[PDB]
Structures are given as structure tokens and as C-alpha cells.
Design a protein around this ligand. Sequence first.
Ligand SMILES: NC(=O)c1ccc[n+]([C@@H]2O[C@H](COP(=O)([O-])OP(=O)(O)OC[C@H]3O[C@@H](n4cnc5c(N)ncnc54)[C@H](O)[C@@H]3O)[C@@H](O)[C@H]2O)c1
Ligand SMILES: NC(=O)c1ccc[n+]([C@@H]2O[C@H](COP(=O)([O-])OP(=O)(O)OC[C@H]3O[C@@H](n4cnc5c(N)ncnc54)[C@H](O)[C@@H]3O)[C@@H](O)[C@H]2O)c1
Ligand SMILES: NC(=O)c1ccc[n+]([C@@H]2O[C@H](COP(=O)([O-])OP(=O)(O)OC[C@H]3O[C@@H](n4cnc5c(N)ncnc54)[C@H](O)[C@@H]3O)[C@@H](O)[C@H]2O)c1
Ligand SMILES: O=P(O)(O)OC[C@H]1O[C@](O)(COP(=O)(O)O)[C@@H](O)[C@@H]1O
Ligand SMILES: O=P(O)(O)OC[C@H]1O[C@](O)(COP(=O)(O)O)[C@@H](O)[C@@H]1O
Lengths: 310, 310, 310, 310
Amino acid sequence: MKVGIVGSGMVGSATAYALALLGVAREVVLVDLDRKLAQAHAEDILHATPFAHPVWVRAGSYGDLEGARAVVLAAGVAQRPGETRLQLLDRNAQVFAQVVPRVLEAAPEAVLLVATNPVDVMTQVAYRLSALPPGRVVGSGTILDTARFRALLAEHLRVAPQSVHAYVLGEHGDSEVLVWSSAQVGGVPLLEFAEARGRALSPEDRARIDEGVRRAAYRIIEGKGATYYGIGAGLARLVRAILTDEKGVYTVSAFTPEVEGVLEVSLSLPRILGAGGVEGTVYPSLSPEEREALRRSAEILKEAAFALGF
Amino acid sequence: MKVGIVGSGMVGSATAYALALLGVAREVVLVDLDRKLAQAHAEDILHATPFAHPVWVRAGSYGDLEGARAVVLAAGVAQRPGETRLQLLDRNAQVFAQVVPRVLEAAPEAVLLVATNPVDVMTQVAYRLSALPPGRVVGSGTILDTARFRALLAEHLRVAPQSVHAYVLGEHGDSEVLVWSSAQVGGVPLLEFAEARGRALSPEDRARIDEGVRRAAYRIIEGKGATYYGIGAGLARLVRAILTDEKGVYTVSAFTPEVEGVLEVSLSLPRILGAGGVEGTVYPSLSPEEREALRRSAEILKEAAFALGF
Amino acid sequence: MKVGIVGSGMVGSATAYALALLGVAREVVLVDLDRKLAQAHAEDILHATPFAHPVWVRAGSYGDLEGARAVVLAAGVAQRPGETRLQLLDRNAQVFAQVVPRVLEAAPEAVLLVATNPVDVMTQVAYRLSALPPGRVVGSGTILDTARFRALLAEHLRVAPQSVHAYVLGEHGDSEVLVWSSAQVGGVPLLEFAEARGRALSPEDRARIDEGVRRAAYRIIEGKGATYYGIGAGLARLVRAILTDEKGVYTVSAFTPEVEGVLEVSLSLPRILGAGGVEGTVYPSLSPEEREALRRSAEILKEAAFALGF
Amino acid sequence: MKVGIVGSGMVGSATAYALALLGVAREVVLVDLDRKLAQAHAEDILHATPFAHPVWVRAGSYGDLEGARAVVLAAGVAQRPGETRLQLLDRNAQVFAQVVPRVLEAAPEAVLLVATNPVDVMTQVAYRLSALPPGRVVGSGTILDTARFRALLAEHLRVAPQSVHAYVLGEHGDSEVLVWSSAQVGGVPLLEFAEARGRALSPEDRARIDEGVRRAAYRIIEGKGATYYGIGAGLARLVRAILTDEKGVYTVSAFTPEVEGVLEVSLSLPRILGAGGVEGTVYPSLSPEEREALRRSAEILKEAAFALGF
Ligand SMILES: NC(=O)c1ccc[n+]([C@@H]2O[C@H](COP(=O)([O-])OP(=O)(O)OC[C@H]3O[C@@H](n4cnc5c(N)ncnc54)[C@H](O)[C@@H]3O)[C@@H](O)[C@H]2O)c1
Ligand SMILES: NC(=O)c1ccc[n+]([C@@H]2O[C@H](COP(=O)([O-])OP(=O)(O)OC[C@H]3O[C@@H](n4cnc5c(N)ncnc54)[C@H](O)[C@@H]3O)[C@@H](O)[C@H]2O)c1
Ligand SMILES: NC(=O)c1ccc[n+]([C@@H]2O[C@H](COP(=O)([O-])OP(=O)(O)OC[C@H]3O[C@@H](n4cnc5c(N)ncnc54)[C@H](O)[C@@H]3O)[C@@H](O)[C@H]2O)c1
Ligand SMILES: O=P(O)(O)OC[C@H]1O[C@](O)(COP(=O)(O)O)[C@@H](O)[C@@H]1O
Ligand SMILES: O=P(O)(O)OC[C@H]1O[C@](O)(COP(=O)(O)O)[C@@H](O)[C@@H]1O
């Protein structure tokens, strides 16, 4: 099987690295405007393969994406001093108007996995331009925020992250919704589990954890300039779910007909991931405060998309 | 690291095979009264290692368990031509009186993982004889039952079993409790999830599944004569959690001070598993019906233990 | 991807178990005349999946094999007391004459992996009946003998088997050829490495090791009746190489146009294994003594396949 | 188990990333003068864990290395504009003079794995300053050059790199030695194997491959600015060999008493890797030209180390 990655920057390359180390696919193709950049990352990653799994890693053109079961869109415009959030959005939408049709021309049957930020709006753009069934276009969404939420809770509880069933929904950003209400561990309410563990989650602890998730990216960027290991692994995990027709449940972004009264908007909800991309959407147990948060998050994304024309 | 397995029958050897294939430990030692048997299994598994991971698989004596972080107790007696079950229960308790002291004498710090049936009572016996803290003695318990419940639900919902958070508690027997009330998928009640999945769980479906779990072993024995693959993988999973100090949550058996009223009895509950064995016990959200069922199970188990004198 | 296994005995089930534990394929189908048996094993293995990877394990008929990229042929051998060598052969050959066309009818593109013994003769038989290119029909051959040679050398040298580059060629039987002449570790001749390691291989050690390989199966059977863990892993590994189009080198059996003179004979040689089965065959450096022993090995097999009618 | 990494740049972080994704150790500690850099990388990697294996990833000080079984030394100062490699070497040696004692103060029994370049010289420095047994100080050496040699050959032959038994010895640099003489695939000499595969290695192909290996870093740097994925996977693989007491053979750098008549020099040769670091060294079959090449490489490295006072 083959996986394509358009945009060979830190995110696209870290993603290829994860796919290689975990042996998700026999072939990985990197495509970038800067051909020398993609070739360098590709050789660097190919050299890692003898230590792990045989994988044909190479740089290429859109045409080289032929036959790919999934293509990760991690292409973005370089940020500069004095660039509002909207200015970025417009520029990246221009990038996608070029990339999407070019990718689909070479790999018409590929599932598109959107990473470019703002991921929810870009997922909407990809969806509109692709003219494919809604589920064929998936955005990473809050899959990384959910991981962050689980990792911070795990550190507080001294339990493996994978045993912490907590979710983050809505916008991958400021208005995201941490679903404390139905969070559970071992089949019991999170707060109740924490107490039993002797590591109760006080209101102070919860506010601190909220900040940790919400300000996660900002803090990482402050220390190293950009984030990429976390998303790289999240993208690789989603790619594997797709290539293996896993039918696993993840909080990812996709075109949603209606959510809390907001129509035609892309945001994250728990969904079933398989060979055709998203093949099922679930609407979880939300408290009133959470439903309110979700509505607001959806309206924010709806207006951002609308202003752009999608 | 080293893992020991006392009792090289189908269960014990199947566990060793899974451990080797997954490369959980650098060394696996098999010990059995029938040395030819243990040696045959050890060589057969050793021959599989070049296809998987480097593991020194070998047969030996109790002294060869020295240094083992975990030792699986899968040693039991063969049923006689015209004997009952309580007959075996006493016979096996005598095996443990020989095995336990000999094990802890060679590996004083090892965590004991009990597989021998009846697993719950055998766990309490191991507990009494070991003179180690409660958590150091763990029984497979309903770990396999929980696995069957998720597998059956997975087939019905067409989702990965790992995405189905449903548990089976109590006795690893007919009095086990299927926790339907708190079962969830994607943070949604099981029934509601099945609904939105277009694969609703009718009263009949639930009844058919409930029976598929309870009669699982019976059905397999009818066609195979015994079960080993399922439990072998479960035991290997638990050994891995222990060696890596995972801190993962599983439904396993352990000496419990108080459960739904009953006192000092070994039964399954969701517990945190790590280097010291079980290091935390929690009680899931149960319905009135399930509570009563769990109490009955505990009472039933308490009575059985007392009778043997443990 | 789907993998099929015909014959749910100990070999067939152990192979399925390894495939499940390693998550090689999303679906594994067991097919066996003894329907209850295949169902018992399928169920036992399915229950292990929640501990490893999501795999749809089930029992079924030939039609359920459609889409399978690889089908393991492990059915036959059911010798009667007093029954002759050839007599048993004819009975197996007949089984194959019925199984092969039915499997290829359901999955025409599937690669055939033969396990039934005598594997070399049964591989030639499946080859003639299949009407497919020579590489589409692969036999386990000396895959296990090679693993045994490495394992025993590994124990003597105290190094990982994967670092011992030694092979066993020819027939998977008494005529097998242990290639001592060109065996190497770290790019150094075996004997020269052994000495540098402070663990020289005396003529006594070699004879002993040679005996440990040749009598491997015999010794295991004395202890537990039959072998299956070693071959189960080997088969699972070859299936993985095929499903992932690995292009890895293994000593397996396949119809061979010419071997040291003998024409049209099936036996083991280092071959490149990929999605189309074997796609390359080479002859390692052999010493006069090894080359001659291989020729006689090819002769025996040649005569054996003829007498049978293939 | 715990692994420490001093130097949280791209190499150090990429290494921690591979370790986390592969679940090599339960705990990974990143130590860096730039505290915010190490914290940001640690959080970014911690966030990837829910998608793979539970690993406590964190930034810390030397005291946090306590109990570490292995500590990767990837520390180095940023090169100044116009500064030469030799001038940079002096500064990095001073860093080691400070780093080595601190590491050993906190983790006296740890194996030190050197990554900072020039790796052979820095390994010699680490060795002299450490005062530990020779095998306890290991340098990545030519592990990556060997990987590159195999990757390039694999692409030419269209076979898995792990099936290509070729090595690169001596200096991790311009004088490195490509051991063409004893390189083999399937027990067959490399050139002979290439012919059979129908992809012969012409003099021109061999020269191109030599340049491909020798100029690999240079070529990646001109496109990416630096290399890190390849070495990150190689370092992680070595760490794993150490923690599991693998006893695997790899081409790595370590203090060598005598090589081609050159005394007390650090360079790469095939070695056995286990819990104590390197526990055995062997000398591969070398042609006259390779021996000459190795001698020159060894002389270049001894002079280089001697100039620093090591
Ligand atoms: N979804 C998440 O959780 C998440 C996490 C981290 C980063 N991101 C986002 O992913 C994007 C990329 O980040 P990055 O750090 O890798 O940045 P870079 O490191 O800026 O990566 C962008 C690359 O895309 C390439 N590119 C632009 N147009 C292209 C085109 N038309 N065709 C092919 N390649 C093209 C560029 O040349 C550049 O190398 C950003 O929008 C970033 O904000 C998302
Ligand atoms: N926990 C579960 O869910 C589960 C699942 C399947 C089987 N089991 C149980 O595991 C046990 C073993 O099953 P099995 O199929 O391997 O049976 P066998 O095939 O009956 O295995 C028992 C082995 O223990 C050995 N033994 C007895 N005393 C010993 C001693 N003192 N020292 C060393 N070895 C000793 C015996 O020689 C025998 O080979 C049974 O009690 C079975 O009911 C439990
Ligand atoms: N082993 C190999 O084959 C190989 C391959 C590629 C790069 N490298 C080498 O690894 C080194 C690092 O490369 P990099 O790309 O990560 O560079 P960076 O990205 O330059 O990494 C160096 C980091 O170490 C930190 N540091 C310096 N002194 C320290 C000290 N005294 N204590 C704690 N931390 C300290 C610095 O703050 C810096 O962030 C270089 O010497 C590079 O040449 C080796
Ligand atoms: O804790 P449980 O109920 O045994 O579930 C464990 C399973 O949960 C998972 O973390 C998935 O959880 P989610 O479905 O909430 O995302 C798996 O990775 C893991 O195998
Ligand atoms: O010891 P080397 O030369 O680094 O080769 C190591 C590789 O050898 C293998 O054991 C394969 O050896 P073979 O090609 O002889 O079968 C791989 O599993 C392993 O990755």
C-alpha cells in the first residue's frame, strides 16, 4: 500500500517518519513545492528504515501519488512577522485550491487527511473543492487535543493515557470543548476515579488541565517554534486506521450537516474510521454547559468558513 | 527481563508463545512436573523466535525462576475418570501449596499471576499461601470474559473491540456480571451508539450476546476440548503490563477486603496494573440489578473459599 | 486484507493465532471439514484480539475466502495405523486435488502457501494442480529448519538468532543440507566468529548442533505429540512478507526448473518473497560436499514427485 | 526502565520520538541547557503517546537521570558563523568535559551512547573522561552509514534492506570503508546476487552508491539544513538493544586497543550489543584494499583524537 503526503515541512516529515517507524505502509511519497526539501526529508527517513521496517520512501510530484489509499495534506504558507489569522486562512485556501484537484487527479480514490491549519476550516475547503462523499475528507481536528487531555489527566492520575476515556470536541482551537461530563476510567466517572486513586481532581486542577490543553500549542511553539511530533503520530495513527479498515473511534473533523442547530460546518465529533474515511458520526453525552460550548464553537467555524466562501 | 511459567500445558505454553511472538521478555522459563513436556514446548517456541524477537525460551526447575519479575501459575491436575469439581479444587490447592512456596523461594520479588481454575478461588489460595501484599497476587479473573463481551459486541456493531468500553465483573464463572448499564462507545451509552450505527441491540440481540459470553468456554471445549489461545493472549498482556509498569486498567481477580457487603474474597473488578501487580481497585457505575448480581457472585465466592479453609 | 487457512488443526490454528496477535491482516478465515473444530479455534483466537489488534477471525467455507491475498494449505495428514508412507501420501494428494481448485475458484489471485507434509512433494502437487505461474505456489520448506539452525547457533554463541546468517536448504527432511561453509555473523565466517566470541564450535559441538536440527521435530514429538508453535510463526511470517510485498529473502520451497542438474523439482533455496509469492531464486555459496548433498536431495524429491504422478 | 537524552535538539528529540513511538522505555528524560527547548520537545512527544505506547516523557535536570539504563549524549554548541569544524570540535569537547561527569554522577551504571559529532572523536573523549570499562561507552559510529549502504543497495536490488548484509566500517565520515568484499544477500556474494536478480551492479553503479553513502549527509543538509530522522532511529535501535540485552551485532564506535597497527583509537567495527554496552568486537573479512582503507581511516582518527589530548 501507498500513502502520499503533500507538504514536506515539519508536520509532513514527522508524519512520514512515524509511518516509517511503525511500518504502516510499504510506500510513502513526499511532495513539496521545494523539491529539494522533500528529497532531503525522504532520504533522511529512508535511512531509518533498516532499523525498523522495509518502506520505499521517496520524494515526487502529484503524479507520483497515483494509487495512494490516503493522502495527507500538510502544506501551508510560511508565517511572517505581522500576519493576522485571517490573512493566513486566505493564503492557505489558495494553496488548497491548487493542491486538492491536483491530488485527486492522480489519486481519485484516495481518502484525504487534512492537517493544515486552521484544520477545521481547511477541512471544509477541501470538502467543498473535492466533490467527494463527505466521509472521504477527514481533518485531524481535535484528535491531538484529545490526546493532550488524556496525557495531562494520565500524569495527574499516574495511569496510562489509553485507559483514560476523555474527549475534546468542536474546534481544534480556542473554543474547543473538553467533555468532562462523560469522561471515564474503568467505567467510573473521572472525578470519582480520581478520588479513589487518592489523586482527586480539584477545581484548581481542572482549570490548570484546561489551560494545559488549550494553551498546549502556544507553549510548545514558545519553546521550539512549532509543534510536529504530536500531530505527526496522530496523523500516522489515522492513516493506519484507514489502510487497515480498522473501524476505530476517534475525535476527528469532517463536514457535519447539523450540530446544535448550526448547519454545514466542519468540526470534531467521535467518528468511526475505516477504509472509506469517516463512516459514522456519534453525538456524545453532553452537559448543558458543554452543549452551549459546542454551539458557540460551531458558530465560530461556520462564520469563518462563510466569510471565505465555503 | 525474565518471565516464569509453572505448568507447561496448553494454557502455559500458549502464554509463552504469545510472550515470544510479542517479545515481551528477553527470557521465558517453563517449569512442569513432566520435564519432557516443558522441554518440548520450550524448544518448539524457541524455534519461533527467529521469526519474531530474540527470546531465550527454555524449560527448567523452580530454581531457574530466579530473578523473574512475574511468574504465571498455570499448573493444575488432570480430571479423573469419574471425579467431581470440588474434588479438583482441593487437589489443585495442594498443588499450589507445593508450587507457591517453591516459586517465591527462587523469585521472592516476583508478581504471581494465577491462571489455574477455578481462577478466583485459586487466587485467594495463592494469596493466603504467599504471605505477600494483596496486590502481588493477581488472577486472570474475568479478563477473558470482558474480552469476549467486547468481541461479540464488536462483531454486532462492526467496530474495533478496543473501541468498546464494556466490562464483565465478579466470578470467572456462571455468576459473572455483564455491565450493560455503563457500557459505552465514543462516550455514548452502548444502546444509543448501536442505534446511531444502524445496528441496534434488540432485547434478543442482548440475550444472544449475554449467552455467547457465558457459554464461550463451553462452546469452544465442545469443538476443541479446551481453550488456550484467548487466555494465553490475556495472560501475556497482563505480564507485559507488569514488566513495563504500564499502570493500565483491566478487570482482574484479587483478594478484596469488602465487595457489596461480602468480606475478604477474590473476584474481578477494574484495577490498575503495574510493576507491583494490582495497585488500585475501582467500582464501576452499576445498576441495581448488576449490584445484586455482583453481591450474589461475591457471596458465592466467599462461601467456596471458606469451605476450602481460605 | 484477508488471509485464509484451510485445515484448522494445531498447525493451522497456531498460524492464525500468530497472525492475529501480530495484526498481520484485518480478517482471517478458518476452513475445515470439521466445522465445529474450525469454529472452536476461530472463537478462541477472536477472544484474544482485544489484547492485541482488531482482526475479524472466523470459520467459514471456501466461498468465504474470496479476496484473500494468501491462503495457507494445512489440511491432510491423518495416517492410519499400519498405513504406509506412500499410501498416506496418495490420500493427501487426493485431498489437495479437491482443495486447490476450490480455493482458487473463490480467490483466483491468492498466493498459495503449502504446509501439509511432506511439504516439498505437496508443494509440487499444489503447483501442478493450480495452473498458476511457478512463484504463486510456495511451500514452507526449510523455513523452520533454518530457524532451528540459527536458534541452536544462537544459544551456543550467546547472540540474537537474527544476527546469525546461516541457512538450511534442499528437502524439509532427512536429506536437508545445513550450509556450514558460508554461514556468517557480522560479516565473518561462523567458526572464526565463534572463536573470537570465546565460544568456539568444536567438531563435537557442530555434530551436536547438526543433530539438534535434523532431530528437532522428532524430539519435540517425544515430548508433546507434535510440533506447531515454530511452524505456526514461520507460516505467519511468510504470510506477512506476502501481504506487505516485503521482498525479503527466505529459504522456502517452490517449483524449481533446475537444481544442480535435477530438473522440475520442488525444494528450498533462498528466495525473494513478495506480493506475488516467490519472485526470485538464488543459490548460496556451497562447498563440494554441500553441493553434492543438495543434488542427492533434489534427486530423492524428483523421484518422489514422479512416482506420485506430479 | 528509563532512558536519558542530554541535548534536546533535532537529533536528541528525534531519538526520543522514535523511543516513544516504539515503546522502548516506560520513561524518557530530556536534559538541555535551554530548559524551554527540552520542555517543549518533551510535551510535543508526550502528546504522541496516546496514539502509541504509554511513556512518561519529560524535561529534567541531571539529577532526573537517576536509574537510567542508558543515556544518549547528543549535546553540542551552536556553530558560529565562519567557525571551522575543528574550532567547533574544541568547544564541543569542553561541553563533554562538563556533561559526562554530571551524567555519571546521577546514573553511575548507565551505558553512555554518544551521538555528538565527530562521533568517533567524541566517543574517545567520552571514554577518557568516563573512567568506565571500554564497552560501557558506545558511539553511533557508522551504524547510519551501514543503514545508508543497505538502503541504496535495496533500492537498486528491489529487496528489503534487512536482507542486505553489507557493512560500513572505520570513521563515520570521509574515510569510512564500504566493505564490498564480503557483502552478501541470501548467502550469495553481493555482485553475484545482483546478477541473478537481473539488476547487476556495474562499476558505475558501485561508484554512484559509494558517493551516495559518502555524501549522504551533505546532500540531506543542502535540502533540509540538517539530518536527524535517520540517526534518531539508529540511536533508538541501539538503546533498545541495550535495554533488552539483545546481544545483536551492529557496526558502532568504541575504544579499540589495536586496528591495523593503530593503537587506542575509537572507530566502528561489527560488535555485540547488550546490557553492558559493547561486549565483543569482531574483524570482518577484508580485502587488501579495505584493510588499507581501514588503516588510513584509523590513522586519521587517532591523530584527530591526539590533537585534542585524548
Ligand atoms: N492539525 C494539527 O494539529 C497541526 C499541528 C501542527 C501543525 N499544523 C499545521 O500544518 C501546516 C504545516 O506546518 P509545518 O510546520 O509542517 O510547516 P512548514 O514546516 O511550513 O510546512 C509547510 C510546507 O508545505 C509546502 N507547500 C506549500 N504549498 C505546497 C503546494 N502547493 N504543494 C506541495 N507543497 C506545498 C511548503 O513548501 C512547506 O515546506 C501548518 O498550517 C500548521 O499550522 C497542524
Ligand atoms: N483463567 C482462565 O480464563 C483459564 C482459561 C483456560 C484454562 N484455564 C485453566 O488453566 C489450567 C491449566 O489448563 P491446561 O489446559 O494447560 O491443562 P494441562 O493441559 O492440564 O495443564 C496443567 C499442567 O500443570 C502441570 N503441573 C501440575 N502440578 C505441577 C507442579 N506442582 N509443578 C509444575 N507443574 C505442574 C501438569 O503437569 C500439567 O502439564 C486449568 O486449571 C484450566 O482450567 C484457565
Ligand atoms: N551520531 C550521528 O551520526 C549524528 C547524526 C546527525 C547529527 N549528529 C550530531 O548530534 C549533535 C546535535 O545535533 P542537533 O541537530 O540535535 O543540534 P542542536 O539542534 O544543535 O542540538 C544541540 C543541543 O544540545 C544542547 N546543549 C549544548 N550544551 C549542552 C550542555 N552542556 N548540557 C545540556 N545540553 C546542551 C543545545 O542547547 C542544543 O539545543 C551535533 O554534534 C550533530 O553534529 C550526529
Ligand atoms: O480502558 P478500556 O475500557 O479497557 O479500553 C482500553 C482501550 O481504550 C482505548 O484507549 C481507546 O479508548 P477510546 O475508545 O475512548 O478512544 C484503546 O487504545 C485501548 O485498547
Ligand atoms: O546482522 P545483519 O548483517 O545486520 O543483518 C540483520 C538482519 O538479518 C536478518 O536476520 C535476516 O537475515 P537473513 O537475510 O540471512 O535471513 C534480519 O531479521 C535482520 O534485521
